[PDB]
Assembly symmetry: C3
């Protein structure tokens, strides 16, 4: 079936803005761009304060006994073997976001330097770029991951997101004020959440084709690729799977390419250097406040750290929904360590090669900084290697596949929440959604409340699992063990007492 | 049955400070406060090291299996609800001291900077203040709280610090050479601890009088001796139920936190919550190792005035917080009661210095600057006066430091009575007041001797009377670890895992 | 009993090495030195990366189940108790390194600064020194130590490094490419490793005797200490047990006299000081990849932290043995921390006292750095105190003490890794290989990796211990 109670408020606002951005007061939309500023500096803290709390809590829980609990009907066989499951995360744990931002972020920090430190600090350059792209971002997922996952596969209920809040607003009666609203606010941040990498993919080509053959060629390019959304899911059988390995071959290749063509020793060296520093500056990073230092970091932080936080939150639905799947039969722990450590530790080695070389080239004077342009750097530093174009091609096509990976999946997810949450593949809705610095701004305002949704989600999560039979058993059993062991002891002290007073 | 071997000895020292200091010579009391440099110079390292030790110490017993042991009889349960129990903690975690150092503290740090830190350094400045007022201060309180809550509750001894050394000391009637001694080291330290709070709390008030009237050296003599007269109307002639101002405190303190939160730079104040917890955590070890060798050996002096004082002050109070937290505590687990103590009080102190002290910083950045001529006593009235209707608030402020003194004193003089008479839960109304005035007398006695640097002489004696007790609380770990090893539950468990090992060994 | 298939490939290189660096070839064994740089630069990442994991590793080992099971026969009464055991471990905690380097290093770092900082800072100059001398050099031992012992005392497999690789390789199947290669590079390692701990001592004696008999003679000393490496175990027994104990009392005395005569507070104001800092600066120093800062520390890393790891890596077969040998019946847990808590305390305080005093003297204008050679400095601050020359005499002796206990025992590991990893070996082999030392970084360059696999052979192997094998062979 379809949820035409969640769909209808959906597009009325989706397009209310869409048409509102292309038409009417065309520049009226740039009042919103100056409107986030209310949210960024009034809530920045909220984002940061809770953004970190998100990292500690997920980890305590995995570590906690809650983690042994398995995700699906009691006693279920993993979807993939413990070395076949490994390959699965990559399918979600990468995208177009890594390439445009991934080779410019360490550089841009090694260049300008981050608030609180001097320029040309390779160390911070590595510590601040991972802050955003490793431990922190992924934990915003695994929260929503687990609540969504535990909601559906274990308890055995609906693939709708607001569902995971039934242990707070009750169950089956949280459909109104709170509930439908969540789904609505869910679909929206998934339409905007997508284009933020979709329309972006066109922009990276709008300045990407310069490697071969500008601000209006995007419309022609957008259709070149979008015409392939209706073929991959609508016309072609199956979803993803095939592309997941494509990214390893394509990504793994250009990466091992660079790791062996570019001097390896420096990138390899910065391998522990990357982690080491991360750890040393992670707490200090998490206390960064517009108030610090001297209260002049606000516009840096709104620009970078608050920019990603807000953004990840406004993208955690797709990625909590997508990660839930193919995590059935996997337990809590193995799934939390799953979504962290590895997706975390891939990104890290990725900024280690793109970042290390990108920098080592400024260490000498072969700057890759293409007039301060995110799309220019990527290639500016591989056409500085043999076959710069021979790979630069595979990079284009790498940002091509990624266009449909995100789209494909995203639509899977969004289309899934409009059907009453059922998994079955809905060709019809997957295709319809497909079509549906002002690139970095529309996402974050759109699901501002979401931050409070994942905040409260901690409880709705911890409250609900805590009633899981296995864990319910474990704590019941503790009481019996605790008191039984009481009887055994109170008696002795009456036996060893009566016996004692017998020696008189 | 008042312990007189214990009661008189504590007083012989109480009287000596007051009699020697103001009535006769005066100039000579400041000689013993040359001894203070003595303590910091060559016993300085110890306060610094065992300070950070107490914090680890406590977390690992909480972390340790002992954590599961229940205060009281086996599988006992807490007397009141988690929320109530906690609810007790916020009151425990506020009084005259935050008032005094709420604002000058982190400001003095942004204003002047910290050794190893360039001045105007928000993150550091804040994290140093958090340093003094969170886990390290509260590790100590729990160290002593546990010891007390455990001896009376579990092994059922007398509510006396000595009765918590019994595992390590004879015994056959604990408190021989030792123990009488120990309790004596409690009373005294408990007097000068509360003294400062009574002390700097007083002159905070004389200062505050400026907001309403204008208008003094004799005026501080009046400030205390009046509310000190009103510790008697408070305990001498109790009416209805004695509990009552504890909340009468909380509300005012609430109007102030709320008042300034919104009026003052709110988003900043909010920005300090994530910000300050983080610098803290991040700066937790770097400041842990700040002795008088960093920086270049120049932090020696800075430690003396601040950092060391928190160490001496927290210690010389642990006899009071320690019984308080203990008394409330019965019914918790060591693990539940540790984590509770470090985390719960700490929320408040972190929130407090962010708002009260965190506007003083913001201001100092717009040039407003509440520095008030460099005196910290007046800084609290000052920053408020920079806000709409801050004058009415200054008034409440005084009346707040009023209520605090009586409430600061009664709770002390009860504990101090309780340990002056063989640790009776039942508290003699007549004895308490005695510890009321005696303590008030030394608190006042410290203000008057000093003149313009009245603050200085206060923190240097309370540092000396503390130095002894610090060893007490160090030893108190050792008793505490031997007491927890012989406990039923930890012992009975080691018989079951060695068994859950032996059972499997012979079947295979 | 003498294994002559492992002695040959090693005995040939050793006979050859002393020579090819002699007879007018003395220059071409010098350009050969610079080929060390080659390693530090492409295996630079190698140490600095794992050096730090070993620590976390053992911790994460001592932390988990494996910890509880006793080393050796199921639930055995150990060969000591806590109050006594505590003495035997100390035997390793003190040495010849901790002579010149304790005073000089903390002093150096204070004076010139270490990369990524300013100079004259006391915190960094401690935490940096402690860092090179704490957990980092004791995990690279604990892994060697814990593995060997478990191969023989638990499992009972002969006491020889390759034997610990059984898990990863095969039961009796290692013999081929991996193992024969091990046993040989676990000699080269034992020779040179200790050779860079004695080589500094053959000199520092002549340098330190320029504090006694002001002012060729360097080589006369090598014998006057070596001449009592054989008459110390060959005739009468008990040197390993008797010397280390005495020597600790010497070093203790030394330390204590300086501690008291030297300002007491400063040293004693630096216990919290070093510890607070060592924790604080732990992860930053650890990730001190040369890439930092600005690409600069390449060289600083090469002079000490990285060179530091190699030598330490070189030390794993000889050192890793004894700490395993010493322990029977005592759970790995009471051993991992055993060899982690003690090392930091003996080291920390030791640097604290001597290194810290040095920093104190520099601050008061009383510099003892003069000229600028490591070997001259210890005696510098020494003679700067009452009874200086005198304590200086025992400090002299200290140099030669343990050197004998570390030469007679550097010898023992060889004698036992010669005769099929036999605990007890014939006397002639141990002493004969005691005159061998009578390049450190590349001596052990491959042996790093030998540790890493040793880390997998220690985890994979346990998971085939009885507790984990029984559950394994059950429902699963
Ligand atoms: C709140 N107490 C009075 C218990 C002490 C805190 O300053």
């Amino acid at each position: 079936s379809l949820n035409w109670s969640v769909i209808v408020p959906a597009l009325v606002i989706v397009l209310a803005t869409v048409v509102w951005g292309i038409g009417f007061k065309d520049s009226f939309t740039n009042f919103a761009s100056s409107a986030l500023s209310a949210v960024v500096d009034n809530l920045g803290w909220a984002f940061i304060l809770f953004g970190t709390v998100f990292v500690f809590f997920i980890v305590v829980i995995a570590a906690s006994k809650f983690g042994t609990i398995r995700l699906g009907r009691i006693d279920e066989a993993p979807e993939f073997r413990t070395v076949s499951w490994i390959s699965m995360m990559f399918a979600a744990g990468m995208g177009i976001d890594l390439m445009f931002y991934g080779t410019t972020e360490p550089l841009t920090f090694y260049r300008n330097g981050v608030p609180g430190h001097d320029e040309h600090n390779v160390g911070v350059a590595m510590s601040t770029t991972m802050f955003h792209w490793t431990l922190h971002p992924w934990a915003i997922y695994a929260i929503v991951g687990l609540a969504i996952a535990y909601s559906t596969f274990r308890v055995g209920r609906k693939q709708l997101l607001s569902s995971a809040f039934v242990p707070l607003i009750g169950e089956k009666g949280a459909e109104g004020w709170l509930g439908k609203l969540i789904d609505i606010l869910a679909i929206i941040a998934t339409v905007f959440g997508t284009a933020c990498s979709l329309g972006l993919g066109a922009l990276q080509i709008g300045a990407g084709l310069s490697a071969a053959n500008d601000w209006t060629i995007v419309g022609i390019v957008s259709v070149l690729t979008l015409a392939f959304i209706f073929s991959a899911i609508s016309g072609v059988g199956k979803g993803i799977q095939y592309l997941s390995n494509a990214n390893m071959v394509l990504a793994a290749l250009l990466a091992i390419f660079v790791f062996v063509v570019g001097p390896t020793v420096s990138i390899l060296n910065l391998l522990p250097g990357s982690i080491g520093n991360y750890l040393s500056n992670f707490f200090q990073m998490a206390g960064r406040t517009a108030m610090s230092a001297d209260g002049t970091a606000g516009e840096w932080l709104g620009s970078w750290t608050i920019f990603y936080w807000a953004w990840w939150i406004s993208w955690s639905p797709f990625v909590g929904m997508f990660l839930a799947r193919i995590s059935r039969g996997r337990s809590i722990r193995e799934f939390i360590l799953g979504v962290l450590l590895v997706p975390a530790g891939v990104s890290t080695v990725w900024f280690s090669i793109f970042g290390g070389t990108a920098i080592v080239f400024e260490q000498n004077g072969e700057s890759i900084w293409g007039d301060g342009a995110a799309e220019e750097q990527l290639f500016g530093l591989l056409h500085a290697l043999p076959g710069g174009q021979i790979m630069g091609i595979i990079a284009m096509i790498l940002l091509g596949t990624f266009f449909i990976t995100s789209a494909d999946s995203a639509s899977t997810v969004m289309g899934t929440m409009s059907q009453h949450g059922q998994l079955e593949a809905n060709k019809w809705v997957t295709a319809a959604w497909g079509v549906a610095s002002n690139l970095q701004n529309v996402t974050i305002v759109a699901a501002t409340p979401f931050l409070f949704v994942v905040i409260g989600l901690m409880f709705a999560l911890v409250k609900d699992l805590s009633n899981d039979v296995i864990y319910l058993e474990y704590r019941e059993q503790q009481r019996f063990n605790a008191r039984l062991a009481r009887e055994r002891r109170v008696h002795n002290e009456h036996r060893k007492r009566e016996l004692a007073a017998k020696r008189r």
